[PDB]
């Protein structure tokens, strides 16, 4: 065989009776999943993988953009000098897993090494028809509802250069985040509750791993440097509403090693109607939030980081929560796959 590029088709367990927007998209775009998927273990086969040069990421991006451009129409769409005022209906939003498959003549290679960084040779390789179910969860800073590392925490960088664009941290233990907009003055005020005991323990393990990659040096976290609110805050979509969460307390250096740092971390969040589209062409204004108790429980399965360059790194290495490039979100799931032609 040999490496190649081709058109992939998607698979899902969508429902035809669902008004849910991902289900509506998947019933039109994807086929029913294979009840009995077959994978073939190729004994004694070494294969090179590169998550940073994987076109599967390119295709998924097109699909997720198409999904949002078809089903998330705002009232006011502000692109250029054009002010489009259209009808904005409140929708049913909840991402469902999507499988990406190869057509006849092509097969997906799967790297099964438990400690694979995403770029290099893989000794335990299998061939599959489709990838696992991936939820198209669009988020910044924190990767939500994704997959976990099977063994150790993994630091993902292309590392052609110490000047990396994005550093993907793949967690091996999920940390629950409980974002809520309570039923009872302001209806834009929301908050995400996070267990400090678990989070600070995980974050401490993350610094421990970053030391292995950066000369065993002191790891310092810091608030984001510049940019629109979509990247200076935890940006994500919950039930159709756009949330912006101040994560300054999530990266509390003092809580990384011993006082009352455990207990519940309450992140201040707000729902904004005027947003910068991630697609992303111009701004868009949406309808005011729905009445009730808007709630989203998510699994933090990854972190997106930026290492400060041009600094004096004699004893310190400074990292800031990153993201914005939604392609990175797909790479954190597609890293172990690549398409080859028979």
């Amino acid at each position, epitope marked *: 065989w040999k490496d190649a590029d081709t058109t992939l088709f998607c698979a899902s367990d969508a429902k035809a009776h669902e008004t849910e927007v991902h289900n509506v998209w998947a019933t039109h775009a994807c086929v029913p999943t294979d009840p009995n998927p077959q994978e073939i273990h190729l004994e004694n086969v070494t294969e090179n993988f590169n998550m*940073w*040069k994987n076109n599967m990421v390119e295709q998924m991006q097109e699909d997720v953009i198409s999904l949002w451009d078809q089903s998330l129409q705002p009232c006011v769409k502000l692109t*250029g000098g054009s002010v489009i005022k259209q009808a904005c209906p409140k929708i049913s939003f909840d991402p469902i897993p999507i499988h990406y498959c190869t057509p006849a003549g092509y097969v997906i290679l799967k790297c099964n090494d438990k400690n694979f960084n995403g770029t290099g040779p893989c000794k335990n390789v299998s061939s599959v028809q489709c990838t696992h179910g991936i939820k198209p969860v669009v988020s910044t800073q924190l990767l939500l509802n994704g997959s976990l590392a099977e063994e150790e925490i993994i630091i993902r*960088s*292309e*590392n*052609l*250069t*110490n*000047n*990396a*664009k*994005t550093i993907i941290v793949h967690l091996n233990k999920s940390v629950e985040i409980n974002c809520t907009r309570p039923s009872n003055g302001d209806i834009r005020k929301a908050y995400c509750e996070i267990n400090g005991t678990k989070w600070n323990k995980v974050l401490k393990q993350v610094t421990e791993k970053l030391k292995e990659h950066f000369n065993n040096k002191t790891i310092i976290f810091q608030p*984001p*440097s*510049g*940019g*629109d609110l*979509e*990247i200076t805050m935890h940006h994500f979509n919950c039930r159709g509403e756009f949330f912006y969460c101040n994560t300054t307390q999530l990266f509390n250096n003092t809580c990384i090693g011993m006082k009352g740092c455990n207990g519940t971390i309450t992140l201040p969040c707000k729902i904004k109607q005027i947003i*910068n589209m991630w697609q*992303g062409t111009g701004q868009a204004m949406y309808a005011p939030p729905i009445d009730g108790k808007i709630n989203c429980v998510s699994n933090i399965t990854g972190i997106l980081l*930026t290492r*400060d*360059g*041009g*600094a*004096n*790194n004699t004893s310190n290495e400074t990292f800031r929560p*990153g993201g*914005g*490039n939604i*392609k*990175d979100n797909w*790479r954190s799931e597609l890293y172990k796959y690549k398409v080859v032609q028979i």
Partner: antibody
Amino acid sequence: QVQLVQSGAEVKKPGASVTVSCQASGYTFTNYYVHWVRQAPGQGLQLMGWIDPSWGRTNYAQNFQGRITMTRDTSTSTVYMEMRSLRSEDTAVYYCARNVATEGSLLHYDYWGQGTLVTVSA
Amino acid sequence: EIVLTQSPATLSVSPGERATLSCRASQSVRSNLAWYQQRPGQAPRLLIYGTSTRATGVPARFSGRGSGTEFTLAISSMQSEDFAVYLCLQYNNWWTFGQGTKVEIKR
């Protein structure tokens, strides 16, 4: 067809501020990081920092950490660098370069602006 | 923090002859090193990136060699246009330039 054009020459007094600009064209503006590099008389080229015009993240050098600020106007495809509390030794030509990059790594420069002369004296 | 030292500061080459410029790095920059041409009162022009890869438009007489901390830029046959300043840039860790090398016309 790629082209970077910087603003005109500026003359300022010590203790004042200044904003240099650079307008991009011929390519997708949000796909390339934009770096500001200066060259003081009788000194080598020095990088002040960069800005990713997409969202847009900024990274400054330690020597300019609290004195400079970089912004972008995605609509006009323009990158601004405001430099505050100018000193005499800030007198230099301030170039503007776009940065070639892969999907997860930042590499070299390729296209440069004509450069902006900034003169600071009493 | 990575210092690039170019030697010599000034190189005298008679037209048609070969010119060899050197760039030493204080620390290993792997292969992330690029060369630029700079004419007086003008922006730097990219010649070779990734140590030995010519930019599209650069004539074949330019070539880069060496890896690690020692680098060299070669001009097989000097033309009138080639007599300028040549800068080396590392982009392995942050971005730092060399002081440059002026290639004058030997007479």
